[PDB]
């Protein structure tokens, strides 16, 4: 009948793939901790690799993104500075 | 406007491939999420290429394009 719900009327879209899943365990410990530091994820002391991946993955599944802008940022930075170091402290906490 | 016209060309080709290959909306979002965290100084270069391995790694031409764009030596 339609026009009564916002659900999908195809049951299953055209996709023979189970949707590729991202392995976050491959990432370096430093990378996962960096995610937690840059996104500010307060955690308990004594974190391990598996712990990081779970926390990172849980938050990684909920990242707001925009095609045009995200592509622009990617294209821009990579064609300019491929991972710039620039060692500088922002917040003078101590 | 003035994006994928004269400036962006082969990049748009790449992204079209990625969009068409991943097929899943959330999977393509995943790719873009890898992009934003890379942009946000979170993940390293190789970390970026490696992360999308289960996605773009199936497609040699596509993943190689990605490597070539990132300047991925590994040599």
Short mmCIF file of N, CA, C and O in Angstrom, two decimals, chain B residues 8-19 62 65:
data_model
loop_
_atom_site.label_atom_id
_atom_site.label_comp_id
_atom_site.label_asym_id
_atom_site.label_seq_id
_atom_site.Cartn_x
_atom_site.Cartn_y
_atom_site.Cartn_z
N UNK B 8 39.20 18.66 -10.73
CA UNK B 8 39.10 17.28 -10.30
C UNK B 8 38.61 16.40 -11.44
O UNK B 8 37.52 16.62 -11.98
N UNK B 9 39.42 15.42 -11.81
CA UNK B 9 39.06 14.56 -12.92
C UNK B 9 39.26 13.09 -12.60
O UNK B 9 38.29 12.34 -12.48
N UNK B 10 40.51 12.69 -12.43
CA UNK B 10 40.83 11.30 -12.15
C UNK B 10 40.47 10.96 -10.70
O UNK B 10 40.19 9.81 -10.37
N UNK B 11 40.46 11.98 -9.84
CA UNK B 11 40.07 11.80 -8.46
C UNK B 11 38.59 11.44 -8.39
O UNK B 11 38.19 10.53 -7.68
N UNK B 12 37.78 12.15 -9.18
CA UNK B 12 36.35 11.89 -9.24
C UNK B 12 36.12 10.50 -9.83
O UNK B 12 35.18 9.80 -9.46
N UNK B 13 37.00 10.11 -10.75
CA UNK B 13 36.98 8.77 -11.32
C UNK B 13 37.19 7.73 -10.22
O UNK B 13 36.45 6.76 -10.11
N UNK B 14 38.22 7.96 -9.40
CA UNK B 14 38.51 7.10 -8.26
C UNK B 14 37.31 6.98 -7.33
O UNK B 14 36.88 5.88 -6.99
N UNK B 15 36.75 8.12 -6.93
CA UNK B 15 35.65 8.14 -5.97
C UNK B 15 34.40 7.49 -6.55
O UNK B 15 33.65 6.83 -5.82
N UNK B 16 34.18 7.66 -7.85
CA UNK B 16 33.07 6.99 -8.52
C UNK B 16 33.25 5.48 -8.42
O UNK B 16 32.31 4.75 -8.09
N UNK B 17 34.47 5.02 -8.68
CA UNK B 17 34.81 3.61 -8.56
C UNK B 17 34.56 3.12 -7.14
O UNK B 17 33.93 2.09 -6.94
N UNK B 18 35.06 3.87 -6.15
CA UNK B 18 34.88 3.50 -4.75
C UNK B 18 33.40 3.41 -4.39
O UNK B 18 32.96 2.43 -3.79
N UNK B 19 32.64 4.42 -4.81
CA UNK B 19 31.20 4.47 -4.54
C UNK B 19 30.50 3.27 -5.19
O UNK B 19 29.60 2.67 -4.60
N UNK B 62 42.17 0.11 -8.36
CA UNK B 62 41.60 1.11 -7.49
C UNK B 62 42.53 1.40 -6.31
O UNK B 62 42.82 2.55 -6.00
N UNK B 65 45.67 3.14 -7.50
CA UNK B 65 45.38 4.55 -7.71
C UNK B 65 45.51 5.29 -6.38
O UNK B 65 46.18 6.32 -6.29
#
